[PDB]
Design a protein around this ligand. Structure first.
Ligand SMILES: [Cl-]
Ligand SMILES: [Zn+2]
Ligand SMILES: [Zn+2]
Ligand SMILES: [Zn+2]
Length: 122
DNA sequence: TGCTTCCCGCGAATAACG
DNA sequence: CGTTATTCGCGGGAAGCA
């Protein structure tokens, strides 16, 4: 196979055969296991780099386009990702975006073609 | 030690299937 | 096209880096 299961207290866990990492969702183990197999490739469409997860490539490509999707709603500054946005708000505004903040806006991705969540443009 | 990347549960978007 | 199976964007913590 590619995993085995483990059950404690009815809780079902899926364990990677290779590194023994534990997953609550089989789809997550599948997502993860590509790291070992490289069955699927995700090549950057701007340079040579290849990635083993779709999202690693996506985040990498955002760096190529320089799009800044995360905007601080307190002062208007924009950031390329959640982490810089959160870092900013905690440091400059002494507030936490965690949970439902209403402190930042995530703009739709426009600088390349990725699946669009409807909630991002209402 | 302040960035930077890596990770995984969750659930919306969509591809596969019949 | 209707169901379901699959993909992968998202949050936000953890791990890595130099
Ligand atoms: Cl922008
Ligand atoms: Zn593994
Ligand atoms: Zn690239
Ligand atoms: Zn701000």
């Amino acid at each position: 196979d590619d995993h085995y299961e483990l059950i404690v207290d009815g809780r079902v866990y899926y364990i990677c055969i290779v590194c023994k990492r534990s997953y609550v969702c089989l789809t997550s183990l599948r997502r993860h296991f590509n790291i070992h197999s490289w069955e699927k490739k995700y090549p950057c469409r701007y340079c040579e780099k290849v990635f083993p997860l779709a999202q690693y490539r996506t985040k990498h490509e955002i760096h190529h386009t320089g799009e800044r999707r995360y905007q601080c709603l307190a002062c208007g500054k924009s950031f390329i990702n959640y982490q810089f946005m959160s870092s900013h708000i905690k440091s400059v505004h002494s507030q936490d975006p965690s949970g439902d903040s209403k402190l930042y806006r995530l703009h739709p991705c426009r600088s390349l073609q990725i699946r669009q969540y409807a909630y991002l443009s209402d």
